[PDB]
């Protein structure tokens, strides 16, 4: 395992993140759905306050999920374009040449997400496999100055406090699905 084909190490590495990224999805989706259930439970107990703040969490967890489906995709995208990834060695290349196919918008973000998503430890492997293809400077140029990192990404990683409106709107919806009678403060 010394002089083995890049194209291979990368294909297996990505394939991994996918497998785990989806696992996190299935698990957190089911987990979040059971939280919704409990949210309704708190309504049927006049615990208005404890049902409010609780939902705020429901949002951040739901937003996290989104960030996963998005990272999933970004990988799959790269996995296919593996052949095209092997023909790169400088930043200039990826930057102003593979921006239409989304190769850049995908790899750059994934590396950023490393710190923020710890349920897919294997992601870090990609950062390392970048110096293997480019350098150790590229990675630091992302984790630090998120150069060309999608807006929706950086934002779903550290989601801003939930808007009062969205919360109330959420509660009202959880009620129209489980029961409850009075959703006050709307």
């Amino acid at each position: 395992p010394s002089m083995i084909p890049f194209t291979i190490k990368l294909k297996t590495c990505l394939k991994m993140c996918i497998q785990r990224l989806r696992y996190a999805q299935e698990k957190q989706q089911a987990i979040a759905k059971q939280s919704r259930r409990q949210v309704a439970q708190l309504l049927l107990t006049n615990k208005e306050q404890k049902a409010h703040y609780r939902v705020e969490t429901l949002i951040h967890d739901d937003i996290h999920i989104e960030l996963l489906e998005i990272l999933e995709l970004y990988c799959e995208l790269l996995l296919a374009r593996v052949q095209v990834i092997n023909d790169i060695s400088t930043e200039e290349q990826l930057v102003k040449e593979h921006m239409d196919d989304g190769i850049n918008e995908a790899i750059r973000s994934l590396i950023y997400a490393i710190l923020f998503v710890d349920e897919v430890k294997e992601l870090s492997q990609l950062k390392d496999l970048m110096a293997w293809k480019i350098n150790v400077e590229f990675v630091n140029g992302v984790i630090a100055d998120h150069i060309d990192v999608p807006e929706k990404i950086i934002k779903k990683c550290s989601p801003s406090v939930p808007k009062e409106e969205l919360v109330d709107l959420y509660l009202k919806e959880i009620a129209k699905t489980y029961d409850v009678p009075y959703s006050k403060l709307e």
Binding site: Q29, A32, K33, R36, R37, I59, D62, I63, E66, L166, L169, Y170, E173, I174, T177, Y178
Partner: peptide, 17 residues
């Protein structure tokens, strides 16, 4: 019921878009 919470979730997300 059972399949009612499924759509609920489906509608939730879009509701934040």
């Amino acid at each position: 019921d059972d399949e009612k919470e499924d759509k609920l979730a489906q509608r939730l997300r879009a509701l934040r878009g």
